[PDB]
Amino acid sequence: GPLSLSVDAFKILEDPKWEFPRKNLVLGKTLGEGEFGKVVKATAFHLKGRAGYTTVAVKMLKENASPSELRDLLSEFNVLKQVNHPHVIKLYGACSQDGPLLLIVEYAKYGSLRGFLRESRKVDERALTMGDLISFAWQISQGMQYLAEMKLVHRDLAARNILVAEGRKMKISDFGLSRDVYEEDSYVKRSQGRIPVKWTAIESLFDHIYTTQSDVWSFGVLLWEIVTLGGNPYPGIPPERLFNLLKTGHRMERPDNCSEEMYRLMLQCWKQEPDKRPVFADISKDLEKMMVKRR
Amino acid sequence: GPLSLSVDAFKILEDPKWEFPRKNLVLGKTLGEGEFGKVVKATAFHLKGRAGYTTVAVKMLKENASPSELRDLLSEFNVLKQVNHPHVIKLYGACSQDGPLLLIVEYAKYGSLRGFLRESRKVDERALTMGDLISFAWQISQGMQYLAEMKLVHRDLAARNILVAEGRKMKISDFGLSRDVYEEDSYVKRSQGRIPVKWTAIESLFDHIYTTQSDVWSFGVLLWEIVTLGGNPYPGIPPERLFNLLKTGHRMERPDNCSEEMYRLMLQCWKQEPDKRPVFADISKDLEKMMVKRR
Numbered sequence: 272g273p274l275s276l277s278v279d280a281f282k283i284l285e286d287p288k289w290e291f292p293r294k295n296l297v298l299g300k301t302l303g304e305g306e307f308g309k310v311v312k313a314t315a316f317h318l319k320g321r322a323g324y325t326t327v328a329v330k331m332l333k334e335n336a337s338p339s340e341l342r343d344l345l346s347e348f349n350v351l352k353q354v355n356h357p358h359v360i361k362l363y364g365a366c367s368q369d370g371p372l373l374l375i376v377e378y379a380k381y382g383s384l385r386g387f388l389r390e391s392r393k394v395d396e397r398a399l400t401m402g403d404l405i406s407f408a409w410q411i412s413q414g415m416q417y418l419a420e421m422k423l424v425h426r427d428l429a430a431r432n433i434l435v436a437e438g439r440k441m442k443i444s445d446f447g448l449s450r451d452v453y454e455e456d457s458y459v460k461r462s463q464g465r466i467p468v469k470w471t472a473i474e475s476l477f478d479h480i481y482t483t484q485s486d487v488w489s490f491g492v493l494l495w496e497i498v499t500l501g502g503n504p505y506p507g508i509p510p511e512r513l514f515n516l517l518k519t520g521h522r523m524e525r526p527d528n529c530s531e532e533m534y535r536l537m538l539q540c541w542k543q544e545p546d547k548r549p550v551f552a553d554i555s556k557d558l559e560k561m562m563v564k565r566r
Numbered sequence: 567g568p569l570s571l572s573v574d575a576f577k578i579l580e581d582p583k584w585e586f587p588r589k590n591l592v593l594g595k596t597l598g599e600g601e602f603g604k605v606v607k608a609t610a611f612h613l614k615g616r617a618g619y620t621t622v623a624v625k626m627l628k629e630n631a632s633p634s635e636l637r638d639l640l641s642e643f644n645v646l647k648q649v650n651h652p653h654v655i656k657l658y659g660a661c662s663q664d665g666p667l668l669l670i671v672e673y674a675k676y677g678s679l680r681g682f683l684r685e686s687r688k689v690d691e692r693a694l695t696m697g698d699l700i701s702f703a704w705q706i707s708q709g710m711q712y713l714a715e716m717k718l719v720h721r722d723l724a725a726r727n728i729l730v731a732e733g734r735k736m737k738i739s740d741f742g743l744s745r746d747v748y749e750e751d752s753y754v755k756r757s758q759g760r761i762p763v764k765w766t767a768i769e770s771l772f773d774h775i776y777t778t779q780s781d782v783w784s785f786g787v788l789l790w791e792i793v794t795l796g797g798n799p800y801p802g803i804p805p806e807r808l809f810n811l812l813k814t815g816h817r818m819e820r821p822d823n824c825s826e827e828m829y830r831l832m833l834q835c836w837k838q839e840p841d842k843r844p845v846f847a848d849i850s851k852d853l854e855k856m857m858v859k860r861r
């Protein structure tokens with residue numbers, strides 16, 4: 272079937288530009304488990320012209336991986352090798368022979384944005400200003416604008432899936448569910464999606480249509496996560512209630528420590544009609560203006 | 567879409583025969599996480615005519631549930647209410663209103679068969695004889711024969727998905743991926759399956775066709791798990807290698823502490839041609855004969 276074809280073909284192009292000798296990779300502690308596998312901290316010797324060891328992160332299949340998980344890992348690999356942007360996590364290589372499939376990616380020092388925000392507070396030990404939060408949102412919007420121009424839909428935008436690198440630089444990550452959208456400006460999935468309900472656009476939930484505008488919806492939820500310093504969306508509400516809640520026009524209320532303009536932006540991202548939501552270029556301009564205003 | 571229809575309809579038949587008052591249910595420690603959600607130990611007051619409290623297990627959606635996970639939970643509910651057999655886990659009810667969806671099922675005292683076997687040894691503190699192991703396999707084969715006659719394919723048969731109840735009674739569980747097969751004697755899935763590669767039949771892996779005969783393949787792997795007291799199938803072999811390994815005719819070798827007849831049975835379950843594999847009625851007769859022989 273489709274996966275056996277991909278796997279056999281994959282083990283046919285041992286692309287030297289992505290293939291990295293397994294003996295030059297040393298695996299360390301588990302950093303956590305993502306959408307399709309686990310992520311471990313690692314170090315790589317003589318990686319991509321870099322002298323000595325380079326600290327990296329490695330993505331691999333969990334125990335008892337399914338075909339769906341293997342497909343997702345190959346998908347992320349396929350996408351990551353096409354993209355390059357300061358706010359998208361960087362692929363360094365892969366190990367595809369003489370062992371389990373491994374993706375070698377850029378190591379983000381502070382881990383996920385969600386964890387980063389939860390360890391913080393507003394000015395809980397790290398002090399973040401509203402200015403910092405706007406900056407984080409803006410960097411992500413910039414990365415998304417790039418991905419959108421690349422005709423890619425991310426589909427799984429959320430604070431758990433953004434990484435914080437050295438210098439507090441946002442890196443969009445987790446591309447296992449991302450899809451090419453060039454031909455039709457949409458990705459449609461017949462079966463049920465594997466993206467969490469509470470981050471999914473109304474038309475994606477009901478009609479299984481994914482577009483950049485559905486990514487914009489997810490960015491609105493992400494925005495809410497940032498402003499609430501890693502709060503849980505639709506708190507206390509079961510995911511199965513979201514069908515009725517969304518279609519009757521309900522949205523999350525304005526959270527604490529959130530300006531009228533910021534909330535307006537969230538609401539705009541959650542407009543029922545995808546065409547009424549702003550594009551990422553619009554979003555970036557909105558955030559930029561908020562930044563300069565409070566100065 | 568299909569899920570919104572199921573959810574709305576579900577919240578339309580608050581079937582009194584399955585609905586249980588949420589106030590009469592008290593949740594306890596997490597027992598673990600399954601294919602679509604988490605399982606917690608619980609107690610239910612005045613459950614199904616039973617006076618007082620009854621200890622039960624409860625299945626619910628994990629944090630950040632996806633539509634796929636919600637569908638799987640509803641699927642398991644739909645199946646469990648149709649089945650009744652001493653070696654299939656029993657459904658007691660559900661909570662579907664005024665809170666998160668909860669399935670209330672029979673509590674198995676010893677937890678999963680995999681954990682049960684790993685804590686043991688052959689005669690590691692619990693002493694199991696080969697006779698006990700055959701008995702466990704036989705009970706499971708009996709349950710599967712029942713499910714097969716019911717025109718259901720389980721699809722996710724594995725030691726992790728069998729439960730051990732009081733008296734060391736096997737209970738087949740985890741029906742989230744189980745499918746009705748009445749019309750065509752097969753279930754075909756277009757997209758990649760979410761069943762672990764190493765338990766999946768060759769034709770299911772390559773062609774996405776699931777039948778009772780593919781369940782028989784899984785039973786062979788389960789058999790191997792039982793005989794090895796909870797070993798890990800295809801040890802040291804990456805799941806993505808199984809495509810080539812299986813299609814070139816390779817199978818797991820005869821493990822230690824395993825008779826020629828038992829291994830023969832495993833191999834028969836893993837015949838490439840589904841029609842050459844035994845049916846569950848055959849499997850039960852094979853195990854029965856091994857039982858009486860060693861006496």
Ligand SMILES: Nc1ncnc2c1ncn2[C@@H]1O[C@H](CO)[C@@H](O)[C@H]1O
Nearest residue numbers: 303304305310328377378379382383
């Ligand atoms: N490139 C990476 N660098 C550091 N941590 C990561 C990376 N990718 C994923 N993680 C972490 O792995 C876990 C599962 O995605 C999360 O804790 C997440 O932050």
Ligand SMILES: Nc1ncnc2c1ncn2[C@@H]1O[C@H](CO)[C@@H](O)[C@H]1O
Nearest residue numbers: 598599600605623672673674677678
């Ligand atoms: N009905 C049940 N009774 C006891 N434990 C269960 C039940 N269903 C699932 N579990 C446990 O929950 C975890 C995840 O499936 C495993 O440890 C499994 O054994």
